[PDB]
């Protein structure tokens, strides 16, 4: 009679407490190590990518950014890292990382045309270009604020209204323009000490431009500080100007509410479709830990920080 | 054994998840404990994680053996 | 997805008087459909756009409003050469803008 | 703009359709989608697919799998393949262009094509 | 000799590593579960509970919430969520959520009448009413503050100071006015481009209203902004006022220091005598753990977030 | 073996005590990482908990088992 | 085994070091959570640390005297 | 044949799960509870040390502190609790936790002297003296700025501009004056509603003083704000004042980056060459388990909080 | 303010005591606390207990766990019940009014009633 | 808990000249006293409700200040009407509450 | 101002030395830094070391384990101290000032001594 | 550390015409270098303690520039009192202040 261990070949180890190369027959793991490379659709619906526009120049209309205006429904956001279109004047805009982190519960967005052109009083608009955003080598400008500038030396106080109706919670967006002397203030403007006021339900306003000496960027001595607000259903908003100002003509209308995620990766596009995904690329796999990135979007698995995991069984 | 698999993803299934963030220069401080946060808890985690591979593993063999030697009994009365 | 669907099939009119034309949506759309007109032998042409614009088409002889799930095409005149076949479309969502029944207006 | 449908008629079944819109006049040098419009009986009108000129793509979700988009810079020349003519219901198809963002850059399709027929 | 195991009876089961469900006879349980679900006193000394007043109601002396102008020894805060006689003045206290972290470490309130109502020699006091809330059907103010409006159309630069001869430290509340318009303003105060300044050697402040429209909340145009400050021992303060300004009439006096918690519920108030309390009822046990929630009061045991704990020692 | 069940407490005795904060409508990135802070300690000591439980029980079994078997060894040589 | 107790630093190199922060008068809440990041972290530190030298002191002990009782089978059989 | 256990003596025993108290024949140790209980040079570089300055006092160039008007390559910084030698002038430098921060990684100093005390044509300096800073008993001022005063009944606006043409970055400081009352003002300066701008990259600031009562500290009733900026290479700065304007003289320029530390302790000066440092002694010891105080700096090993640590080994 | 006061007498000790006041030429629901004292030889003046018109009460620490105060508000009425007759020292009861708002609200007891004596 | 205890036990006094009375209590109770007197036969009144400030009667004969624990009543001039008892309350705290001792004045 | 050196000699193997700078015209309270400098043939002049009045002092990293500086403000002295002799070479010692804060504090050593020369 | 040297050992140069020495170190040091004079028997006098500024010594005659590492000394015209031992030294970082080697100039 003849009993005892069940033999077997092998060709792997394992690690233990005591040891650290144990070999082992049934070596089970359970990290998950190769990835495909490429973005590629989520659930069936295509995410947002860009390609040097960013989300100041996505949302402010950049006269380069053009090609993205009416976004359909979308999965995430990924935006190239460091981008290049931006904001091509050098402005600045009031708490941007607040807007970021509102931006990443929406999954939907419409644009709706609040104040008409049409509806501008005798003030001139016409005059609002710019050459630090050249269009096909010519002057432009932004394609979602209107620049407001005096008409026959002329500037009647601005005393715009208005009223939400529908079931929806607006989003609004305008600026302050700081000028560099005095001169440049009197000829574009009328008046000197110029201010703006906001008035709502929940929150006030009263600001002034600042007006100094400054280095050059982009051979130019002019700011524009922009500001942004949220307005809830059943309220009322009013403006009111005494010179400088940066009028708004589109808002922004959510429609729909979920997760999604900002994105800082690096690669190009392909045709897909999967469940997760990371900064540099998808996952298609069922083992219950990975080490590429931390910072993953979808029922990913969970993430460590090691090299070597092993649950192995059997004998030896 | 396959049980003794998923007791782990069962275990594990609360597991801290990060949310990143864009604290501007400024505010350089309080960002500051942001990213020690992340250096802290993934830490932890990740030695958890492995400390219990080591028993489990250790017990996956032990038990195992167990086993025969007491299947040898059970045909040596 | 969203789906289009009119009801009225054939229409018999004399010209000079007042005619409508329905467009029954499936889901809330907002104000996002657009309508085309066909000539025989011819390319549409474009008549309405977004819901409440006249942007495009022949000004002060047609007309279209509408909102939730429900459209409608007034006119109040129409002459010899505007007897067509008429179709509704929604652009609220993409990819699949899908476009709706034809329906025929007549002598 | 003089927008012209250059097809070659193909019948053989179980082929690959390819049509090539060309444009004259005007050139790939602005914000536009142009896009592709089928017509045929008992269904109406449906809708291709639409591409930019920087290289993004939108398809029908029906024939995504089977249809693919190119387009030439060189003479621009944007064309259309079809790697299956079985499912082809000799529909007539045209190229047709939308609107620019002077007029809010609504998917509507402005201009349009004289047309051209294929059959199986 | 018959010797071995000593089988038993059993009735529940425990859990382990390897298994689910294993019968245990001597099941010793460490986890409480129950709850008496009822307010009562801690350590023999009445907790103050507010029915529907907030914080802010309470220490600015609402109209409607008379009951707490006097008020003795507590040991903590019962506050019922979102309550309507909050603010009936559509105003806005600053730093709201520094001060309610104030009082986590008071046990003891002692009102001072620092400056009589006859410390103001001709500046008119009797016209400070507002129908926002009323009492018994009839215009009202707050019970803590003095609204100085113009008397016999005119208005002296208010000038005061105070010296903190107490042995302690104290607590000044006050207020900046922002009336609807310029109409309104000439017609209650004498002068415009009011201003007020504070100094207190430790801080400096210069402040003026804020005139704009604004939309109509509870049948009201103006506003109201309160500030608020403590004040050492041995020290000195000083206000001026050439306008708009929110006396203070009475200040409030530490004399005690301790522990306490802010506690939201919803639950009533019933005679007992216990030694820990939870914001949904209280506990007499003695066991180490406990899930019913993580927030407590008192020597409580410790929270976790399971459902099942067992220490049970014996056989099978 | 009751002393060890009330040295239990002496094991744990220091835990993290969570006290409530509050944060107005226009701060809510420093909300979010006090709200991850409260998750992610409760996770981790009722992690703690749950495992040194489970190891206990399995050891006070051992013991129980194998104070019986040497007793009857002794008795039996 | 002294390699062992050497090797026992590798479990644990990377742990959590605290940073001095000077926060003034007018930000109690976010010092608050400051102080709470280091009383949390030491004692879960601290309590690792003492519960993997009890386990290894265990270990370390039943090797010992299984190691001598290994021999003893050796000559007895 | 007799053989069995090695027994052996041992003198101190151990804890375990299952005991309190179980001797031990090699009781081997790892806590570390020994301190020399000196400061001691680092890596033979001599650490930095202050006795009663500040380390406002020193940047601003106290005039108690002439000890270090220049000053060599250090390792760490070491400075005394509740200063005594504070700023003598009752001011307050903004954001000084910040600065406070930033001074943790830098490991060199150079001062520049970037504005000649000759650059000022026409503008009295030699009557910026104080009281509240005497020196041999007689009055002076900072020897870091230069406070400007109206020289024969005049002032006329300042305007400067500096341009960083060496390849490193400076670090600037400057000043505004609170005055105490209108004609203490218009003593010393010329005009009222005085101002000051910054002008510069990523940044703008507009300022003007506030003049109010206040109590009696050290003698004074009036206060200095300062504030303070980074350059970077190839950038430009613009100042401009039309009154109060606390000018600077010296800038800072930084030259090594590396680590370092601030520690707050009392103790005297010793000769030594440490590996390790903490704020109660020095370290010579080789174990990774230490208590005496979590904060540390250099390699030293880690830190706990409890008082017995035993890994020790053998029978018994 | 008369504020009356009424009582049987109850002499039967180990039994009920209830004494009731009685509000005329004012009404409840002012801010207001009232208030019951008992005056005895050998003791001075014990205060019992108050009672807002909320529902609010504050008992003396002696006999809290025996008395209660209730409040009805049909036609302005409180009354004070006590569980042991036998742990009265018959003294002379009294209820009494406190200060309004005007006077800041103070732990005092401005206007009095009538009195009347209780016998064991 | 805070105790009250007088310790004069009775003063003669003719009428029109002065007498003094005293308070003192077993800890620190702030501003926060009051002083009570009954006639023979109803009611007692209201005379002192805070440390410093008068509360009813007329106020050209009585008077009453203190601070600490210690607090003491001075009157002017008294007459054939002013002899009575008189309590000494504190109203710093008021779980509980208790009254002072018995005070006769006399001639 | 005044700085004399009084140089004792000390001319003896394995022995030490000392020097007693000392200051007239003035007192040692005052913000400069006193220094001593050597110098010999072949290798030029050394800076030996230097001290201030509130009792700080800078070193030779050569002989920082065998040279020690000392103060007495009771009349203004300062002194040397090297244990060995076979570390001084016959070299030539002198004792100097530095600047003062109004030129801005730099480390040039303006004025200087007499001089005075020791040998072994 | 930081050390210096010069390459030029002796130079014949008589009163009334120009003479250049230059100063080369071993890495930046900003600008920070000092110069001495020693005629035998004097102490040496200071004549250059910044890399670009003058307040020792007699000025207008003498005069010394340099950066990054390398320094040079120009004078106008020199006299008979002029010739003597010129020494090199950096002050950027202490403590090893060394000088530099010896140079002179001859008739």
Known sequence: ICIGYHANNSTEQVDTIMEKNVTVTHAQDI?????????????????????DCSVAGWLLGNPMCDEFIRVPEWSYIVERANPANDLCFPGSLNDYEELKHMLSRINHFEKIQIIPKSSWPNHETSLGVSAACPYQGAPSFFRNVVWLIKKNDAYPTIKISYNNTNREDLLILWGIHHSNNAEEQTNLYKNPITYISVGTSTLNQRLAPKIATRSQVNGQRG????????????????????????????????????????????????????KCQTPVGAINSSMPFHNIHPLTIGECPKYVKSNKLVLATGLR | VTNKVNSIIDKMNTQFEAVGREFNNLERRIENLNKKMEDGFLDVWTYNAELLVLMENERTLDFHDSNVKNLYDKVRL | ??????????????????????????????????????????????????????????????????????????????????????????????????FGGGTKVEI | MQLQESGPGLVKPSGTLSLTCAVSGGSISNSHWWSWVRQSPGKGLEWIGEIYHSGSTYYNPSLKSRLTISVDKSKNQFSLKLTSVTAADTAVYFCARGLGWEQGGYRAFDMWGQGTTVTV
Chains 1, 5, 8 share one sequence.
């Open chain 1, 223 to 274: 700011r524009m500080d922009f500001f942004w607000t949220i307005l809830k259903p059943d309220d009322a908003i009013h403006f009111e100007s005494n010179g400088n100002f940066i009028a708004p003509e589109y808002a922004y209308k959510i429609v729909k509410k979920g997760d999604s995620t900002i994105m800082k990766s690096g690669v190009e596009y392909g045709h897909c479709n999967t």
């Open chain 1, 31 to 51: 990290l998950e190590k190769t990835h495909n490379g490429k973005l590629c659709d989520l659930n069936g619906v295509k995410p947002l990518i860009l390609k």
């Open chain 3, 1 to 98: 997805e969203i789906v289009m669907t009119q009801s009225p099939a054939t229409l018999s009119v004399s010209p000079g008087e007042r005619v409508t034309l329905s467009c029954r949506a499936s889901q809330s759309v907002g104000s996002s459909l657009a309508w085309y007109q066909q000539k025989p032998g011819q390319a549409p042409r474009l008549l309405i756009y977004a819901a409440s614009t006249r942007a495009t088409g022949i000004p002060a002889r047609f007309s279209g409003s509408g909102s939730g799930t429900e459209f409608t095409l007034t006119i109040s005149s129409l002459q010899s050469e505007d007897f067509a076949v008429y179709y509704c479309q929604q652009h609220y969502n993409w990819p699949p803008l899908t």
